Amino acid sequence: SHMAGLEVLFASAAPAITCRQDALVCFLHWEVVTHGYCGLGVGDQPGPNDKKSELLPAGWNNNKDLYVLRYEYKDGRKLLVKAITVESSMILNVLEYGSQQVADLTLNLDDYIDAEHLGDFHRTYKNSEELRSRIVSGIITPI
């Protein structure tokens, strides 16, 4: 049991996946999404193109140092997700925009992404299952 779709998302974003970070944030998007959420858009205030969507928002990958993404839960529970690049790592930091609850998590790109396999979804992810737990158990659960 892990939900289907990461391969698709990664295909659907494929032109956009250029750096390790991009793949990291792509994996993150699908875990947010498969656990109740719908993406809303880029940035931290709603721009003019806020489609409720499962896809990555347009310009989700413009800034390789900082990723800013807004989500909104199937039923309720809105979200502001920041993936901050630091050296060989990312800091995930996530706000429930309406309980100012806050989650954190740091991830070593050296241990999870392969820059030498970016062009191949099947070898991009070095530790799908650990990466999946850490993210679930560290960012999603603290609803």
Curated annotation (Swiss-Prot):
GO molecular function: endopeptidase inhibitor activity; proteasome binding; protein heterodimerization activity; protein homodimerization activity
Keyword field: Acetylation, Cytoplasm, Endoplasmic reticulum, Methylation, Phosphoprotein, Proteasome
Annotated function: Plays an important role in control of proteasome function. Inhibits the hydrolysis of protein and peptide substrates by the 20S proteasome. Also inhibits the activation of the proteasome by the proteasome regulatory proteins PA700 and PA28.
Subcellular location per the Swiss-Prot or TrEMBL entry: Cytoplasm; Endoplasmic reticulum
The keyword Protein biosynthesis appears for this protein: no
Name of the featured protein: Proteasome inhibitor PI31 subunit
Residues annotated with N-acetylalanine modification: A4
Stretches the record annotates as Important for homodimerization and interaction with FBXO7: 4-143
Outcome reported for the amino acid change (mutating I84E): Abolishes interaction with FBXO7, but has no effect on homodimerization
Subunit: Monomer and homodimer. Interacts with FBXO7. Interacts with the 20S proteasome.
GO BP terms, alphabetized: negative regulation of proteasomal protein catabolic process; proteasome-mediated ubiquitin-dependent protein catabolic process; ubiquitin-dependent protein catabolic process
Coiled coil (residue ranges): none
Family membership: Belongs to the proteasome inhibitor PI31 family.
GO terms under cellular component: cytosol; endoplasmic reticulum; membrane; perinuclear region of cytoplasm; proteasome core complex
Organism of derivation: Homo sapiens (Human)
